[PDB]
Motif scaffolding. Structure first.
Motif, PDB file in Angstrom:
ATOM      1  N   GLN A 169       0.790  -1.229   0.000  1.00 55.93           N
ATOM      2  CA  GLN A 169       0.000   0.000   0.000  1.00 55.93           C
ATOM      3  C   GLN A 169       0.827   1.286   0.000  1.00 55.93           C
ATOM      4  O   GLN A 169       1.805   1.407   0.737  1.00 55.93           O
ATOM      5  N   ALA A 170       0.419   2.246  -0.827  1.00 53.99           N
ATOM      6  CA  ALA A 170       1.008   3.583  -0.815  1.00 53.99           C
ATOM      7  C   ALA A 170       0.007   4.596  -0.249  1.00 53.99           C
ATOM      8  O   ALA A 170      -1.190   4.506  -0.511  1.00 53.99           O
ATOM      9  N   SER A 171       0.499   5.552   0.534  1.00 51.84           N
ATOM     10  CA  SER A 171      -0.361   6.548   1.173  1.00 51.84           C
ATOM     11  C   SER A 171      -0.976   7.527   0.170  1.00 51.84           C
ATOM     12  O   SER A 171      -2.034   8.106   0.422  1.00 51.84           O
ATOM     13  N   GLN A 172      -0.307   7.709  -0.964  1.00 46.22           N
ATOM     14  CA  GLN A 172      -0.789   8.600  -2.018  1.00 46.22           C
ATOM     15  C   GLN A 172      -0.794   7.857  -3.351  1.00 46.22           C
ATOM     16  O   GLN A 172      -0.122   6.837  -3.495  1.00 46.22           O
ATOM     17  N   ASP A 173      -1.554   8.359  -4.319  1.00 39.34           N
ATOM     18  CA  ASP A 173      -1.611   7.729  -5.634  1.00 39.34           C
ATOM     19  C   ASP A 173      -0.282   7.932  -6.360  1.00 39.34           C
ATOM     20  O   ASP A 173       0.113   9.064  -6.632  1.00 39.34           O
ATOM     21  N   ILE A 174       0.402   6.834  -6.669  1.00 35.85           N
ATOM     22  CA  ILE A 174       1.703   6.901  -7.330  1.00 35.85           C
ATOM     23  C   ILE A 174       1.660   6.313  -8.741  1.00 35.85           C
ATOM     24  O   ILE A 174       2.702   5.977  -9.309  1.00 35.85           O
ATOM     25  N   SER A 175       0.455   6.193  -9.293  1.00 41.45           N
ATOM     26  CA  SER A 175       0.242   5.596 -10.613  1.00 41.45           C
ATOM     27  C   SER A 175       0.815   4.180 -10.653  1.00 41.45           C
ATOM     28  O   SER A 175       0.427   3.326  -9.854  1.00 41.45           O
ATOM     29  N   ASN A 176       1.732   3.929 -11.581  1.00 44.41           N
ATOM     30  CA  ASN A 176       2.435   2.654 -11.611  1.00 44.41           C
ATOM     31  C   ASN A 176       3.935   2.851 -11.398  1.00 44.41           C
ATOM     32  O   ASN A 176       4.748   2.001 -11.762  1.00 44.41           O
ATOM     33  N   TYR A 177       4.290   3.980 -10.794  1.00 44.36           N
ATOM     34  CA  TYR A 177       5.686   4.290 -10.503  1.00 44.36           C
ATOM     35  C   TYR A 177       6.168   3.539  -9.267  1.00 44.36           C
ATOM     36  O   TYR A 177       6.363   4.129  -8.204  1.00 44.36           O
ATOM     37  N   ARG A 225       7.844 -16.587 -13.353  1.00 43.93           N
ATOM     38  CA  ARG A 225       7.100 -16.994 -12.167  1.00 43.93           C
ATOM     39  C   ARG A 225       6.685 -15.768 -11.357  1.00 43.93           C
ATOM     40  O   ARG A 225       5.701 -15.801 -10.619  1.00 43.93           O
ATOM     41  N   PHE A 226       7.451 -14.691 -11.497  1.00 40.34           N
ATOM     42  CA  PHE A 226       7.123 -13.419 -10.866  1.00 40.34           C
ATOM     43  C   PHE A 226       6.188 -12.601 -11.747  1.00 40.34           C
ATOM     44  O   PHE A 226       6.312 -12.609 -12.972  1.00 40.34           O
ATOM     45  N   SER A 227       5.255 -11.894 -11.118  1.00 38.29           N
ATOM     46  CA  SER A 227       4.415 -10.937 -11.825  1.00 38.29           C
ATOM     47  C   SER A 227       3.898  -9.895 -10.849  1.00 38.29           C
ATOM     48  O   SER A 227       3.475 -10.229  -9.743  1.00 38.29           O
ATOM     49  N   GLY A 228       3.946  -8.630 -11.249  1.00 37.94           N
ATOM     50  CA  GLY A 228       3.367  -7.571 -10.446  1.00 37.94           C
ATOM     51  C   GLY A 228       2.147  -6.977 -11.117  1.00 37.94           C
ATOM     52  O   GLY A 228       2.022  -7.021 -12.337  1.00 37.94           O
ATOM     53  N   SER A 229       1.246  -6.420 -10.315  1.00 35.70           N
ATOM     54  CA  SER A 229       0.064  -5.748 -10.833  1.00 35.70           C
ATOM     55  C   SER A 229      -0.428  -4.735  -9.815  1.00 35.70           C
ATOM     56  O   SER A 229       0.097  -4.657  -8.705  1.00 35.70           O
ATOM     57  N   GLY A 230      -1.435  -3.959 -10.195  1.00 37.42           N
ATOM     58  CA  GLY A 230      -1.972  -2.941  -9.318  1.00 37.42           C
ATOM     59  C   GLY A 230      -1.613  -1.565  -9.832  1.00 37.42           C
ATOM     60  O   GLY A 230      -0.695  -1.412 -10.635  1.00 37.42           O
ATOM     61  N   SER A 231      -2.348  -0.563  -9.373  1.00 29.62           N
ATOM     62  CA  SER A 231      -2.103   0.808  -9.787  1.00 29.62           C
ATOM     63  C   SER A 231      -2.629   1.781  -8.748  1.00 29.62           C
ATOM     64  O   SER A 231      -3.589   1.483  -8.037  1.00 29.62           O
ATOM     65  N   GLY A 232      -1.982   2.936  -8.643  1.00 31.86           N
ATOM     66  CA  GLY A 232      -2.438   3.973  -7.741  1.00 31.86           C
ATOM     67  C   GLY A 232      -1.870   3.828  -6.345  1.00 31.86           C
ATOM     68  O   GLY A 232      -0.815   4.380  -6.031  1.00 31.86           O
TER      69      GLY A 232
END
Ligand SMILES: *[C@@H]1O[C@H](CO)[C@@H](O)[C@H](O)[C@H]1NC(C)=O
Ligand SMILES: *[C@@H]1O[C@H](CO)[C@@H](O)[C@H](O)[C@H]1NC(C)=O
Lengths: 216, 212, 10, 222, 222, 216, 212, 9
Positions: free
Chosen positions: B24-32, B61-68
């Motif tokens: 989790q990020a406290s602010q929206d960081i897009s996909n950065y 085998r690794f994969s990341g996802s999510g945004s904001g």
């Protein structure tokens, strides 16, 4: 592949300066920014600041503002990180890292790290004390106490006894001296007929001890 | 100021499992956002750029996802070398911040500690200090509480724990608590107990001795 | 089996 | 949902979140698999058609092997890097840019002996599958008719022989100009003679992949 | 062709084979540059609007600086990593995910005194550009009316003072419940009081970004 | 980053076997194929073959078929390449490379290479001679003479000196021995107040020298 | 069997130029093509995957394009460190084949050498041989002539040149000639000159010394 | 100036 070769471990007294180097090879040093990152023992990564090797610009985190000075020598493709006025807190591995080609900041390449320990203590051999047994199996060991600096090596019966040995990681005490323990499990009947010697060795001060552990 | 919060801080998994690590990020960081892997004794290496793009060389085998503000790192087909600490990091704005880290560890059957207590040696006593060592041997999971009580008085601030890395044969941990005292305080008292609570124990186990 | 059919056209 | 995917390869290529596996004959989640054959890694190969059926001894012929699951899931990602194609004791080199999981493309090498009913073996890392029907033939031109024609061309030239329909493509030519095909078969190749700008003679050259064949001279009368 | 592109940043973003450059006020190939200023690397910054125009002394306000060419072409690729935004001598920290070449977003830091006509300096690596229209104000509540109301809420509460329309957002609250806004201005903030379940007095708390402001107690009569 | 550390230079007689090692670190050795590549001096890259560390499968190029044996030790994360029946032509630098994660074949990470010379001549240590200087700038250096085979490495002041350093490629003399030079430019302002050492180093026969340079 | 044909084999270009390197393939390989950069003495490193995709870390000054049978490698804004040999390589089918290589050199303003001469050491002399080394410092272009003159007599056949690779920062070359003689022949003579002809010099520059 | 319009709304 790229090489961020950092300088070796450091042992500074409190208040002393320290300068960690980071020579690079594999790419053009001036093309990318250089981050420095702190990692205190058992703790997470923490960004310190960065430098732009092309013009010498720096950006520090508020926490290290004024105390840290990042520089970059384009003549030798090397980035330096100087920490004036070291505090005891400052004991940590310090990484240097090349900034990523992504639009956002990131650490593309990493150095191997540089352990900067900070202690007022001088070189001193350990004080080895027996841990005598007091079930079907019984335990015994060796308190290895008040030594500086790291490391100490510990074996049992000259490396004959290996299975069941547990040499715990050193703990930096309030005095600035390290302290360690090393235990082993043995048959309970084997206490008066088998001898058990812990072979402590402290190369920094040429100190060796062979305490035999007996029950009583 | 942007705060990265990973969860869980640690998890247990068998080889071949699909592990999932959140960030989790406290602010929206897009996909950065970048994921890193740090094995003990070594520098971290990049796993993922742009929250979802694998770095050259990283297994699929690794994969990341999510945004904001919410991100994940899934590890399919868990492998022995995947047991390590994982960090997320935002690069959206200064200061650059990392997450607290997620330690993936080898799952094991529960195992109760073998408790042992060690009175100070007479050779240590003649030096003016005293140390009472408490050993917790070969236990799983890592979570164990150790409590000293000298003459039934709960001590605090005068003991240090130290845990070994998970064993390469039976995947168990071992802990060593150490009660440090002046020789003056050791002789002042009688009973030296060592209470040990663990999931493997039905009740806390105490080991003790009396001076002499 | 489309792809075989499409392959063997070319 | 998870049952959209029909082949084993497509099933294990499914996005990780669906958590799909292959249960002998269906792409399905493990909680609802009724045999102990559920997997996310293993895919056995299978051939059902191979064309062309034969190649000239000189080789160079590119085969087209249609089937399923010719690839190998390495590090949870399919590729043809583990794929091996054995034609007897020699191997056909794969062209990856024109190959997929369901169809393979590979050039056969040269042979010096005729061989009929040879075996094509394909291993994908987990297993192997066979195809016992390939042959190395040696095409021959027994005759041509007619042996002469007008400079305008358009003569229907009949080449006669054996193994003239292997393997990938036939290219008859005269004077370096293309002799456009009318009909192809094992025994007869009909084609229309190209227009020359001079009344002169040329040997009729047949090109079958890497195989070259000359035959009777063809006179261009005025 | 090359004059399709309108900004200096877009001009140098054109693919290399097109061979475009920036000629002061136009994107054009070098053979048609009539000033000695043709370039494929240099892009000077320019601001034309900044909103909001002012922030409370505690700061926390996120600015939006609209303009052109705020970036820096490093290694033939633009990004905002070299971009610096100075509010006077302190810096507003950039949000890269909400910023682009032509618009920037950044959170301002704290001030200690009021400041009017503060200068916003922006450097993009090649040059700097200035913008003197910003103010650090110190919002104040001079009075509130009426001093009491029903527990049902819905009282039209008028806050009075100065600089109450600076920064990003207003949040009046009373008794820990939200006082929904009716109208905003420099001098007057109108809002409707929330319904309380208790008969007691409460201070009216105003929140402007990181700034906090209290005023007179408001009684909830039963 | 990954490290592909190859073994050091070799000097085999014609007809003799040779074995180059390639240890890896930074990733899982069995995850990817490992290519080997030959490069004759002043000549192009040439693919030799590959191995799959997971099962030991190999694929060799036609040119090197029968003469090359690629293997992989998974117990120590290292790849070996043996080339039996060396010919005079086979003298070249040999690289090992990790196969790319792309669907097609490619060389993702590379080792530093291993020069395998093929000659009937035997190995000989270098002979180091000072090249001494005599308010402008002046030059100084280190002559490294009569050694076989290559290479020899040269540094100044333990790798401290980088600017102005010039280590020329070796020149094969009429005798079977190579000869090399290494110079550096310094201010006339320097000596006699700085010390300057060429740390000559010849690994093929374990010969090392660090003579100090000055005119006196 | 697949034949990779690069062009040009070598080129010179000034800093800031657009260099272009083409690569023809004998057969259609789609986009299964990699470009490499090789500095002298070092292993090549990947520049581009899939004919157009940059490898992690490669400057965006590089760009690849093409598909099927023709490919190009563009280097916009040429920099001194771009001095290297560039290779294309197809990975479509065995055997894996590379192109012949393109040797890129940076053109720079002409620069005359700084000549330095080095007499043989006496420790070299009691061994019976003698070497006089002549250093030519940071010059461009690479072509430089050195002529020995022992007591004003033009030497030949008893000296060897050695040129450094182009420097990656100032794009200069350096040459090292070495006149080897027996000690017996070294005593016979007095003056030891070193004539140096180069494009940067208006006249030949000569360096010399006398014994003692 | 289109984008500044949509930027802060
Ligand atoms: C291939 O094998 C079959 C056996 O069933 C045989 O009848 C046939 O003649 C063989 N083909 C040739 C060309 O001989
Ligand atoms: C700010 O600038 C304007 C015009 O430049 C001026 O009228 C105003 O008085 C200034 N603010 C001050 C002086 O506080």
């Amino acid at each position: 592949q790229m090489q961020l070769v950092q300088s070796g471990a450091e042992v500074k007294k409190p208040g002393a300066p320290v300068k960690v180097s980071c020579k690079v090879s594999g790419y053009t040093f001036t093309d990318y920014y250089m981050h420095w990152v702190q990692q205190a023992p058992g703790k997470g990564l923490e960004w310190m600041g960065l430098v732009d090797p092309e013009d010498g610009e720096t950006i520090y985190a508020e926490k290290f503002q004024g105390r840290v000075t990042i520089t970059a020598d384009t003549s030798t493709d090397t980035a330096y990180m100087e920490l004036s006025s070291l505090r005891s807190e400052d004991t940590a591995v310090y990484y240097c890292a090349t900034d990523a080609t992504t639009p956002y900041w990131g650490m593309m390449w990493w150095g191997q790290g540089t352990l900067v320990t900070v202690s007022s203590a001088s070189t001193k051999g350990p004080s080895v004390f027996p841990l005598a047994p007091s079930g079907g199996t019984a335990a015994l060991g060796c308190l290895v106490k008040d030594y500086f600096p790291e490391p100490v090596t510990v074996s049992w019966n000259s490396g004959a006894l290996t299975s069941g040995v547990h040499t715990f990681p050193a703990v930096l005490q309030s005095s600035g001296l390290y302290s360690l323990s090393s235990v082993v499990t043995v048959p309970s009947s084997s206490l008066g007929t088998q001898t058990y010697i812990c072979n402590v060795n402290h190369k920094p001060s040429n100190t060796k001890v062979d305490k035999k552990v007996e029950p009583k | 100021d942007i705060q990265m919060i990973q969860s869980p801080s640690s998890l247990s998994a068998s080889v071949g499992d699909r592990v999932t690590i959140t960030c989790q990020a406290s602010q929206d960081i897009s996909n950065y956002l970048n994921w890193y892997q740090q094995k003990p004794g070594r520098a971290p290496k990049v796993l993922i750029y742009d929250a979802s793009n694998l770095e050259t060389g990283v297994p699929s085998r690794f994969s990341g996802s999510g945004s904001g503000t919410e991100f994940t790192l899934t590890i399919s087909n868990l492998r022995p070398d995947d047991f390590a600490t994982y960090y997320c990091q935002q690069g959206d704005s200064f200061p650059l911040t990392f997450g607290g880290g997620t330690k993936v560890e080898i799952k094991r059957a529960a195992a109760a500690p073998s408790v042992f207590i060690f009175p100070p040696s007479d050779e240590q006593l003649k030096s003016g200090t005293a140390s009472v060592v408490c050993l917790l041997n070969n236990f799983y999971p890592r979570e164990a509480k150790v409590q000293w009580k000298v003459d039934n008085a709960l001590q605090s601030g005068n003991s240090q724990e130290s845990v070994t890395e998970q064993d390469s044969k039976d995947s168990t941990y071992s802990l060593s608590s150490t009660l440090t005292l002046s020789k003056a305080d050791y002789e002042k008292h009688k009973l030296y107990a060592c209470e040990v609570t663990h999931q493997g124990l039905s009740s806390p186990v105490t080991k003790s001795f009396n001076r002499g | 089996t489309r792809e075989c059919k499409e392959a063997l056209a070319k | 949902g998870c049952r959209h995917f029909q082949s084993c390869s497509q099933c294990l290529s499914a996005p990780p979140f669906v958590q799909c596996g292959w249960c002998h004959d269906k792409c399905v989640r493990s909680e609802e698999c009724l045999s102990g054959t559920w997997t996310q890694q293993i895919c056995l190969p299978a051939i059902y058609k191979v064309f062309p059926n034969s190649a000239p001894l000189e080789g160079g012929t590119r085969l087209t092997i249609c089937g399923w699951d010719f690839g190998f899931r390495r590090n949870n990602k399919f590729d043809l890097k583990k794929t091996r194609v054995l034609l007897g004791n020699e191997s056909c080199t794969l062209t990856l840019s024109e190959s997929t999981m369901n169809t393979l493309k590979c050039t056969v090498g040269p042979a010096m002996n005729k061989h009929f009913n040879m075996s094509i073996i394909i291993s994908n890392g987990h297993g192997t599958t066979q195809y016992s029907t390939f042959s190395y033939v040696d095409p021959v031109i027994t005759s041509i008719s007619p042996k002469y024609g007008p400079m305008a061309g358009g003569t229907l030239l009949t080449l006669t022989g054996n193994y003239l329909n292997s393997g990938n493509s036939r290219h008859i030519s005269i004077g370096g100009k293309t002799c456009t095909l009318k009909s192809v078969s094992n025994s007869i190749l009909e084609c229309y003679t190209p227009a020359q700008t001079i009344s002169t003679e040329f040997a009729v050259k047949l090109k079958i992949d890497l195989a070259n064949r000359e035959t009777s001279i063809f006179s261009y009368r005025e």
